[PDB]
């Protein structure tokens, strides 16, 4: 499912991401935009053999099990396919654990490089929230 900007903002808010660990909703929407382009079905393989899954491109080396990442840890306790669902609940719950780690949102390279320090409020402007 390819989300609409305001649609995704509302689902993210509902799920409790607005200001989770200090990050305003604009950040999460911006990160989804540049990580997956609002597509829940996005996958990207990395050089180390791991793969990123879903709307927030969660990595298989540490967070989920895809059965093909030697040494994976599966910290979110879920098969990576669960992150491709049109229902973003799994992605959100796992993202909540990732951002709680020492590095915060810097865990998402797209956020660090394209959202960090920008007017992220723009991502939710015009939305009925």
**In the chain, where the domains are located:** 1-129
Q: What is the DSSP letter of 113?
A: H
Q: Is 101 annotated as a binding residue?
A: yes
d(CA 48, CA 55): 21
For residue 3, the 8-state DSSP code is: -
Nearest to 25 by CA among 44, 36, 42, 11: 11
3-state secondary structure (DSSP) of residue 65: strand
Q: How many Å apart are CA 5 and CA 35, to the nearest integer?
A: 14
Give the residue among 42, 39, 92 at the shortest CA–CA distance from 63.
92
d(CA 68, CA 21): 31
Catalytic residue (choose from 7, 18, 35, 87): 35
7 is catalytic: no
Experiment type: X-ray
Fold classification of 1-129 is Lysozyme (1.10.530)
Dihedral sign (CA 63, 86, 40, 109): negative
């Amino acid at each position: 499912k390819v989300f609409g900007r305001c649609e995704l903002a509302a689902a993210m808010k509902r799920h409790g991401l607005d200001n989770y660990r200090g990050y305003s909703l604009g950040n999460w929407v911006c990160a989804a935009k540049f990580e997956s382009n609002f597509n829940t079905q996005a996958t990207n393989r990395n050089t180390d053999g791991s793969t990123d899954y879903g709307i927030l491109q969660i990595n298989s080396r540490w967070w989920c099990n895809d059965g093909r990442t030697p040494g994976s840890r599966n910290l979110c306790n879920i098969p990576c396919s669960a992150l491709l669902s049109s229902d973003i609940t799994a992605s959100v719950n796992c993202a909540k654990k990732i951002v709680s780690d020492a590095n915060g949102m810097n865990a998402w390279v797209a956020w660090r490089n394209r959202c960090k320090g920008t007017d992220v409020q723009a991502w939710i402007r015009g939305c009925r929230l």
